Amino acid sequence: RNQQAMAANLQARQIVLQQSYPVIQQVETQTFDPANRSVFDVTPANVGIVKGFLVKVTAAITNNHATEAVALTDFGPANLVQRVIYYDPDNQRHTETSGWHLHFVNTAKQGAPFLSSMVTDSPIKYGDVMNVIDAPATIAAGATGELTMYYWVPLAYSETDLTGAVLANVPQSKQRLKLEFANNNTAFAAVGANPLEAIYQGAGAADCEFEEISYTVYQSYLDQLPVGQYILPLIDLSTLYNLENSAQAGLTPNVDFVVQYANLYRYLSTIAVFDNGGSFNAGTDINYLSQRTANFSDTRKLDPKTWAAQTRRRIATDFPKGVYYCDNRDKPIYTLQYGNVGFVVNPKTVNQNARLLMGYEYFTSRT
Amino acid sequence: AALRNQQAMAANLQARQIVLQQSYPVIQQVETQTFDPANRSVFDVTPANVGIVKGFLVKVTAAITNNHATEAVALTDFGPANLVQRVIYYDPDNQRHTETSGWHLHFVNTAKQGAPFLSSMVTDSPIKYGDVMNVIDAPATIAAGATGELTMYYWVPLAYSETDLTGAVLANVPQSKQRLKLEFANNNTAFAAVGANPLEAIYQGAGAADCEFEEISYTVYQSYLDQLPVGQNGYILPLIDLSTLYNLENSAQAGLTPNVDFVVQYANLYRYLSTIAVFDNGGSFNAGTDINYLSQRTANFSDTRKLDPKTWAAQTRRRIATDFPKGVYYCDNRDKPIYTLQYGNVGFVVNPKTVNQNARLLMGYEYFTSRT
Amino acid sequence: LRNQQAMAANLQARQIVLQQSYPVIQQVETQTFDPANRSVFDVTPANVGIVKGFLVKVTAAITNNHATEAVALTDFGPANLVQRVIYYDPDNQRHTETSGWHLHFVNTAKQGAPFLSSMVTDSPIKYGDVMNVIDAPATIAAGATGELTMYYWVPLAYSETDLTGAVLANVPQSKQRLKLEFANNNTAFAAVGANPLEAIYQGAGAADCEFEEISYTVYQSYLDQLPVGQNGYILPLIDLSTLYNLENSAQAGLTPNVDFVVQYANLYRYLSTIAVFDNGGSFNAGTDINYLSQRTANFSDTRKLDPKTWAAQTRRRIATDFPKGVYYCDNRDKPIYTLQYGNVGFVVNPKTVNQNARLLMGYEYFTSR
């Protein structure tokens, strides 16, 4: 009955991918000073099957301190967008997460730092030519820096898997893409302050100001949808593919800190950021990390370097200090199919105000 | 009866499979030569007529001396990719396949590899991997009185890939030779004076007038399939594969005006897999700053990807893991080739922000087409 | 064609197993020791489900107790922390038996990039070498102590999705044996002028370098909750009865400008070949070689190429070059099988041959038990 439903969906998906034509087009641009406004509600266009949004973000920042500079934080330009929230034409919320978490998922799905330029020995002048994602390492006292950042906000899982896409052929009922940008308070961290959400940190932080930020949203969708008597993958279009994040506190030295997957959700990936009191360490404050089921079954209890080794196989490098990734794409964590599962971190040292920022990528049935 | 087609397709696929399973791949040298570009620079190579030919790997080396008393020269953006100026291939029936510039062929080699062709990636590995063998290499500058050594490789494709033989050539034994023509760089194309257009040059600088090749040398390796499988009906072969042309060609168009859409029409018949547009802004090559946007559209005013230069570059970063050189723009249509007939006329669009004198768009295309 | 049945069946059982079992990676052993006391260890894997391989983590602290002279990493560096590996399955059949450097080069070939490396990019976001997964200081100055980390994957199964070579460790009696021979104070340090092939550091202070200590941790990767069907467990019988092994050998007798041929044996389906030209302790970037090739019985070469062009094919495989004097050959799609087409040999025609020259060969292959 469902075995048949599954097959029909996949076939409709296949026909839709074969007959419709992919389009990516600008839906809105705005230039502004976050000192004036930092939250914008973009109204996507209602056209065919929407797969996602590519959001271009640029900014000019000035360090007016008399003598001190500021330097990029570990997340840097990824913190230009503080949060993103999307609602479909039914006002059903899909993704709702931080710019840094969205960016880390973009990297994970690309298999390499998102839209980066790889360095090679080629004498031909390939390289960072176009500065697609870019930000100066430091901004000296009295200097102005230019930054460029891109985020892909997904609806559909991928280019070929339309699970999570949105049918937006629904006139009168619009979608909504909420972008909440960085501002002078969030973007600059004083020495000693927590740099988690900031773009720059340093002794010149107090006198740093955005001169402006601008964004351009491009909506990617499928046009010329195939018609029989309309071919649509009904499971695909009624599943939500979402990203979300949360914070957890309560870490104690040498004790297993467990974060339950309160599932029914099919978790494709998990990111755990160990914000150790504003301190971000390269695994030295952790004994091990693991994923486990009640049955004390640790399917992957690993020391930090070996955990990182698994990630190097996924994105060809390490995520920034204190950021840990876990891929469960092929076999998504689904609790009422494996029984309560949890993500575990056993800290070796815990600073005051220590916490785990959890980011999840998952599928779930709509309505 | 459009079944005849889907029938022929299935048989072509079937045979391609059998041919790939049964035959055995060989790569062998067909010719090597060292010469002085002052004496000659155009060569016609006669490949061996054996089995099904997939392509040619062309190794080129050169020694260049900057004889200037005081000034240096530095690599242009294309650099060693300009060691071969033009490449043209003719099959045993004398039908032309690829006919393009060395730089265009190279950018396509890169596009198809998914990274700068034959480059050595840099990593944190303590083990001594790296640029050990200098496969594609050229000194960044050649000082006054110094001699630099360069190495460049080009893959001239007949077959689309190692597993897709569309475009491959049966070097039967028509007693009709194939021909691979190579027009190399020479002392008049390789060196650009300051202020001169660097497009086709290898080095540019104040010492350019006194630069010369000591020698250029090339080696052509032919890649083919041997031991072709025979059945009852005789030799089993994907006749659609073998009767299709997979070619690269380039062209030039002028007439750009600031803020006006400059449209290059795609021709009919051809199924365009990729498009490269080089904005030679009168000898100036800029990192997108002289362009408003680029697009692909249908006369039906429908742009399927009208994008600002940075967002266009972002798409390319997804394909080759980096940016192509300044002023070089890439467009991948591999999954759904541009085909005017299944879509109506289509054109590649560039709306320039600034246009210098003698501005032009150099177009490079990868496409499939029927022998008839 | 009654074999198409068996194969068709094997492939189906493979998919069911992959689809139904759940992957586990777990520590089976950890140990710290002083190479001065012992350097050979026999690890005993857990006998659970289908075993795919072992991830071996190795850390070491090396002290250069020399008065004034430093030492610098050799081309292989930390890849020589493990000198050799040998694996015996529950039926006492050996699988891999090779050098640590050969195993490491195969790990790289299979990943398609230097194994567990961190690629450098222009990203402003701080990705990079954050965790030093495989790491070793370029030099250890007189009086200093350096910390190294190395990882090796010992394969049983060919890949995550191809279980050819995997081991059913339900077979209880007879434990499996994972034997590891580590570097020690005699193999890790080469004096200037000495052959650096097996060493980790080479230099004027080598004679006074020593291991402060070495430590290792073996993680076993396997499939659990095997699917049970009508007539019992659903298993890919062809996969589980095929051996996927890496092995090394050495050959000498090279003469300038003469083809040196190393014959491939029959029965084995060789997936890859690695040839290291240890030219009397000197390792050159192709300049001591005229060409390399793979040749058939009587016919000619199917790959006679100059060293740079040979290196070009490798660049398409691992996105970079292997260290000096190390040559790779991928035959994964059409394995070399002498039964398929007469004896085949690997050929190296050397340009210059030093005293004590030799080719150190490394092979990856499939064979039935």
Side-chain angles (χ1 to χ4, degrees), chain A residues 179-195:
Chain A
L179 300 175
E180 310 190 356
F181 294 90
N183 63 22
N184 292 341
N185 297 144
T186 76
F188 313 110
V191 170
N194 191 336

PDB file of all heavy atoms in Angstrom, chain A residues 179-195:
ATOM      1  N   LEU A 179      14.857  37.243   7.370  1.00  0.00           N
ATOM      2  CA  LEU A 179      16.305  37.326   7.545  1.00  0.00           C
ATOM      3  C   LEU A 179      16.575  38.311   8.676  1.00  0.00           C
ATOM      4  O   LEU A 179      16.110  39.454   8.633  1.00  0.00           O
ATOM      5  CB  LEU A 179      16.968  37.829   6.257  1.00  0.00           C
ATOM      6  CG  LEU A 179      16.767  36.975   5.003  1.00  0.00           C
ATOM      7  CD1 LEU A 179      17.380  37.662   3.799  1.00  0.00           C
ATOM      8  CD2 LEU A 179      17.408  35.611   5.233  1.00  0.00           C
ATOM      9  N   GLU A 180      17.298  37.878   9.698  1.00  0.00           N
ATOM     10  CA  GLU A 180      17.631  38.774  10.799  1.00  0.00           C
ATOM     11  C   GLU A 180      19.152  38.937  10.743  1.00  0.00           C
ATOM     12  O   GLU A 180      19.915  37.984  10.985  1.00  0.00           O
ATOM     13  CB  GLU A 180      17.130  38.158  12.100  1.00  0.00           C
ATOM     14  CG  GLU A 180      15.654  37.731  11.938  1.00  0.00           C
ATOM     15  CD  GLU A 180      14.958  37.310  13.245  1.00  0.00           C
ATOM     16  OE1 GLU A 180      15.635  37.266  14.306  1.00  0.00           O
ATOM     17  OE2 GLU A 180      13.723  37.022  13.195  1.00  0.00           O
ATOM     18  N   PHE A 181      19.595  40.136  10.383  1.00  0.00           N
ATOM     19  CA  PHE A 181      21.027  40.407  10.234  1.00  0.00           C
ATOM     20  C   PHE A 181      21.812  40.796  11.486  1.00  0.00           C
ATOM     21  O   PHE A 181      21.247  41.153  12.521  1.00  0.00           O
ATOM     22  CB  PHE A 181      21.217  41.518   9.193  1.00  0.00           C
ATOM     23  CG  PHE A 181      20.808  41.124   7.809  1.00  0.00           C
ATOM     24  CD1 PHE A 181      19.500  41.340   7.368  1.00  0.00           C
ATOM     25  CD2 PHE A 181      21.721  40.488   6.954  1.00  0.00           C
ATOM     26  CE1 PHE A 181      19.087  40.925   6.086  1.00  0.00           C
ATOM     27  CE2 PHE A 181      21.329  40.057   5.664  1.00  0.00           C
ATOM     28  CZ  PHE A 181      20.010  40.276   5.233  1.00  0.00           C
ATOM     29  N   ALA A 182      23.133  40.724  11.374  1.00  0.00           N
ATOM     30  CA  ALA A 182      24.014  41.154  12.454  1.00  0.00           C
ATOM     31  C   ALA A 182      23.845  42.695  12.569  1.00  0.00           C
ATOM     32  O   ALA A 182      23.319  43.349  11.655  1.00  0.00           O
ATOM     33  CB  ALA A 182      25.465  40.834  12.097  1.00  0.00           C
ATOM     34  N   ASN A 183      24.254  43.260  13.704  1.00  0.00           N
ATOM     35  CA  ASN A 183      24.236  44.705  13.895  1.00  0.00           C
ATOM     36  C   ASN A 183      25.465  45.016  14.749  1.00  0.00           C
ATOM     37  O   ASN A 183      26.246  44.111  15.068  1.00  0.00           O
ATOM     38  CB  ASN A 183      22.947  45.190  14.562  1.00  0.00           C
ATOM     39  CG  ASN A 183      22.758  44.642  15.941  1.00  0.00           C
ATOM     40  OD1 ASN A 183      23.695  44.226  16.598  1.00  0.00           O
ATOM     41  ND2 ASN A 183      21.525  44.639  16.391  1.00  0.00           N
ATOM     42  N   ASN A 184      25.655  46.270  15.128  1.00  0.00           N
ATOM     43  CA  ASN A 184      26.856  46.600  15.880  1.00  0.00           C
ATOM     44  C   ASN A 184      26.966  45.856  17.185  1.00  0.00           C
ATOM     45  O   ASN A 184      28.064  45.613  17.660  1.00  0.00           O
ATOM     46  CB  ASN A 184      26.921  48.101  16.161  1.00  0.00           C
ATOM     47  CG  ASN A 184      27.126  48.923  14.913  1.00  0.00           C
ATOM     48  OD1 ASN A 184      27.557  48.417  13.880  1.00  0.00           O
ATOM     49  ND2 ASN A 184      26.812  50.217  15.005  1.00  0.00           N
ATOM     50  N   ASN A 185      25.841  45.481  17.781  1.00  0.00           N
ATOM     51  CA  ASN A 185      25.931  44.780  19.073  1.00  0.00           C
ATOM     52  C   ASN A 185      26.382  43.339  18.910  1.00  0.00           C
ATOM     53  O   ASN A 185      27.255  42.875  19.645  1.00  0.00           O
ATOM     54  CB  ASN A 185      24.604  44.811  19.840  1.00  0.00           C
ATOM     55  CG  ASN A 185      24.175  46.242  20.214  1.00  0.00           C
ATOM     56  OD1 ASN A 185      22.978  46.556  20.202  1.00  0.00           O
ATOM     57  ND2 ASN A 185      25.151  47.117  20.538  1.00  0.00           N
ATOM     58  N   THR A 186      25.810  42.646  17.930  1.00  0.00           N
ATOM     59  CA  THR A 186      26.168  41.253  17.706  1.00  0.00           C
ATOM     60  C   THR A 186      27.459  41.022  16.951  1.00  0.00           C
ATOM     61  O   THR A 186      28.139  40.027  17.202  1.00  0.00           O
ATOM     62  CB  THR A 186      25.070  40.483  16.929  1.00  0.00           C
ATOM     63  OG1 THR A 186      25.114  40.851  15.547  1.00  0.00           O
ATOM     64  CG2 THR A 186      23.700  40.800  17.485  1.00  0.00           C
ATOM     65  N   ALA A 187      27.833  41.933  16.065  1.00  0.00           N
ATOM     66  CA  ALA A 187      29.009  41.685  15.239  1.00  0.00           C
ATOM     67  C   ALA A 187      30.381  41.894  15.851  1.00  0.00           C
ATOM     68  O   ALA A 187      31.363  41.292  15.381  1.00  0.00           O
ATOM     69  CB  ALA A 187      28.898  42.481  13.914  1.00  0.00           C
ATOM     70  N   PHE A 188      30.477  42.707  16.899  1.00  0.00           N
ATOM     71  CA  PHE A 188      31.797  42.976  17.465  1.00  0.00           C
ATOM     72  C   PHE A 188      31.969  42.556  18.912  1.00  0.00           C
ATOM     73  O   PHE A 188      31.215  42.985  19.770  1.00  0.00           O
ATOM     74  CB  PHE A 188      32.109  44.463  17.268  1.00  0.00           C
ATOM     75  CG  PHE A 188      31.814  44.941  15.877  1.00  0.00           C
ATOM     76  CD1 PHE A 188      30.749  45.799  15.627  1.00  0.00           C
ATOM     77  CD2 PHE A 188      32.526  44.432  14.788  1.00  0.00           C
ATOM     78  CE1 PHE A 188      30.390  46.127  14.304  1.00  0.00           C
ATOM     79  CE2 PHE A 188      32.175  44.758  13.470  1.00  0.00           C
ATOM     80  CZ  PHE A 188      31.111  45.598  13.230  1.00  0.00           C
ATOM     81  N   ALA A 189      32.960  41.708  19.179  1.00  0.00           N
ATOM     82  CA  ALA A 189      33.206  41.228  20.537  1.00  0.00           C
ATOM     83  C   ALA A 189      34.472  41.832  21.166  1.00  0.00           C
ATOM     84  O   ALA A 189      35.527  41.900  20.517  1.00  0.00           O
ATOM     85  CB  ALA A 189      33.299  39.691  20.551  1.00  0.00           C
ATOM     86  N   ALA A 190      34.359  42.279  22.426  1.00  0.00           N
ATOM     87  CA  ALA A 190      35.490  42.847  23.157  1.00  0.00           C
ATOM     88  C   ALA A 190      36.433  41.707  23.491  1.00  0.00           C
ATOM     89  O   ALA A 190      36.037  40.550  23.449  1.00  0.00           O
ATOM     90  CB  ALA A 190      35.004  43.488  24.429  1.00  0.00           C
ATOM     91  N   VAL A 191      37.682  42.018  23.804  1.00  0.00           N
ATOM     92  CA  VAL A 191      38.615  40.965  24.162  1.00  0.00           C
ATOM     93  C   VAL A 191      37.984  40.307  25.385  1.00  0.00           C
ATOM     94  O   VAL A 191      37.409  40.995  26.227  1.00  0.00           O
ATOM     95  CB  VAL A 191      39.978  41.541  24.554  1.00  0.00           C
ATOM     96  CG1 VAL A 191      40.845  40.452  25.161  1.00  0.00           C
ATOM     97  CG2 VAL A 191      40.651  42.137  23.338  1.00  0.00           C
ATOM     98  N   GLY A 192      38.049  38.993  25.508  1.00  0.00           N
ATOM     99  CA  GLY A 192      37.441  38.409  26.690  1.00  0.00           C
ATOM    100  C   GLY A 192      35.941  38.129  26.624  1.00  0.00           C
ATOM    101  O   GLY A 192      35.434  37.373  27.451  1.00  0.00           O
ATOM    102  N   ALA A 193      35.216  38.735  25.683  1.00  0.00           N
ATOM    103  CA  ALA A 193      33.781  38.466  25.549  1.00  0.00           C
ATOM    104  C   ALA A 193      33.608  37.179  24.696  1.00  0.00           C
ATOM    105  O   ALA A 193      34.550  36.733  24.027  1.00  0.00           O
ATOM    106  CB  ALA A 193      33.078  39.661  24.882  1.00  0.00           C
ATOM    107  N   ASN A 194      32.421  36.582  24.731  1.00  0.00           N
ATOM    108  CA  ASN A 194      32.152  35.363  23.964  1.00  0.00           C
ATOM    109  C   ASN A 194      32.063  35.701  22.460  1.00  0.00           C
ATOM    110  O   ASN A 194      31.207  36.481  22.046  1.00  0.00           O
ATOM    111  CB  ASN A 194      30.839  34.750  24.450  1.00  0.00           C
ATOM    112  CG  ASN A 194      30.608  33.357  23.906  1.00  0.00           C
ATOM    113  OD1 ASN A 194      31.134  32.989  22.868  1.00  0.00           O
ATOM    114  ND2 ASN A 194      29.809  32.576  24.607  1.00  0.00           N
ATOM    115  N   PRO A 195      32.954  35.140  21.620  1.00  0.00           N
ATOM    116  CA  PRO A 195      32.874  35.460  20.184  1.00  0.00           C
ATOM    117  C   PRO A 195      31.896  34.630  19.321  1.00  0.00           C
ATOM    118  O   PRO A 195      31.839  34.802  18.098  1.00  0.00           O
ATOM    119  CB  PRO A 195      34.320  35.292  19.722  1.00  0.00           C
ATOM    120  CG  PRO A 195      34.801  34.125  20.562  1.00  0.00           C
ATOM    121  CD  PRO A 195      34.098  34.260  21.915  1.00  0.00           C
TER     122      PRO A 195
END
